[PDB]
């Protein structure tokens, strides 16, 4: 099922990172997902093609033009037709994590808006924005590589274009050769035994997960399975 | 002072994103910020330049190819001199936040691994690495998108680049015109009072804390003058 992503940017010519390289590259090619730029400096009128002002109240810093990215969204909501969900990035939103994720990529059409200097009119969050989203408590240049950074999480829901999935952090991974500047590949990876295997990295991620993020597992019903791996590797670390 | 940044990346292309534009772009063009790109596919040797592998244990993904990948971290580790700290992008990361982001700016020289596929073998991490570090509870198809996040935000702390400074959500910012869709500028920002105007922000960004991010507030040790315009802000909310 097709995605739709309108994105509102000064600096459409970012997204070439995720359109043109990569699985997300892959997705747009095969028409899986569609990205589509708007560039506020298009719609406006004056010689400079202005896109900044200044704040009201005064203050060191600019903030997005109104008047060429109101008419910009406007372009983007007439273009996207019923049901686009209009979303505002910024350090204010809803913190992004993988249940948001899911959320969002429920929705077969999303407008991002990015913003640049000290952001945008409050008004335009009132009648412009559906949702603010974060991508975290950090403070960048600009809103695209949040919008990117969020096409590409929503991308992965998209059939066709392809652990978290259970609220864990993953299990250590593997590869060539055998013996590694003296460090050995845990033999039970060898053994070729799939259900001790599948156990092995299920304790790990339960290990991995308490030892590093243990609040995230306040936040799990863990199965009877889970529970007993992750008591053995509890004991295993007092022992 | 010069910050520069390696980068490990099977898709370097991606970084034009941010050292071809905006504030970022300014950095580099003006020598503030450095940033150098390796490609583990140059370091292949194959007539196919293979860079994935099949993880030990099986599973349905693939990890990075140990050889080209470690090839071209110790490529990056020689160029950089001495130093330079080694980072790896990945979800089992510590988890950045601004505080975090102002540790990673302390240094002058950053080298950061970008995965592909389901990540890279666990004996690099212990041999090649100095810390690995998450941009958030999310997953992506790659560590590209959060290596250029961390570099965006590490760059706005070099002299010359450009509320979290005391912890707080920003405050709501108005610009032209005066009256938007029949929402208007709060009187006090076109009043001209500089005190008035700088503690009615305050106030909002006290406001906006604790109604969207209480949390946030939990951790700060509060000055007199933020106690009081947050009783404030919640007496008015409760009237
Ligand atoms: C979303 C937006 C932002 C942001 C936009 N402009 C400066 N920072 C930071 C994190 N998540
Ligand atoms: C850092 C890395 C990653 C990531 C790398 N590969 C898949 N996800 C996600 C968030 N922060």
Chains 1, 2 share one sequence.
């Not at 997705?27 to 506020?40: I, Q, R």
């Not at 403070?139 to 274009?161: K, S």
């Not at 593997?174 to 259900?195: A, F, I, N, W």
């Not at 990295?201 to 007993?228: F, H, I, M, V």
Request: with cysteine.
């Amino acid at each position: 099922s097709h995605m739709w992503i309108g994105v509102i940017s000064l600096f459409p010519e970012m997204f070439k990172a995720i359109t043109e390289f990569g699985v997300t590259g892959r997705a747009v090619k095969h028409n899986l997902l569609k990205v589509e730029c708007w560039n506020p400096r298009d719609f406006t009128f004056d010689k400079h093609k202005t896109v900044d002002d200044r704040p009201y109240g005064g203050g060191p810093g600019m903030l997005m033009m109104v008047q060429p990215l109101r008419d910009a969204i406007h372009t983007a909501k007439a273009a996207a037709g019923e049901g686009a969900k209009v979303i505002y990035l910024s350090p204010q939103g809803r913190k992004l994590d993988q249940g948001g994720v899911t959320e969002l990529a429920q929705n077969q059409k999303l407008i991002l808006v990015c913003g640049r200097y000290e952001g945008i009119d409050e008004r335009l969050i009132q009648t412009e924005i559906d949702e603010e989203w974060s991508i975290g408590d950090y403070v960048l240049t600009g809103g695209e590589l949040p919008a990117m950074t969020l096409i590409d999480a929503v991308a992965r829901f998209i059939p066709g274009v392809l652990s978290f999935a259970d609220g864990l952090l993953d299990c250590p991974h593997y590869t060539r050769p055998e013996v590694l500047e003296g460090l050995t590949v845990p033999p039970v990876l060898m053994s070729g035994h799939h259900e001790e295997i599948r156990k092995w990295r299920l304790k790990q991620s339960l290990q991995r997960t308490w030892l590093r993020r243990p609040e995230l597992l306040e936040g799990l019903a863990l199965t009877d399975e889970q529970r007993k791996l992750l008591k053995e590797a509890q004991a295993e670390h007092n022992s």
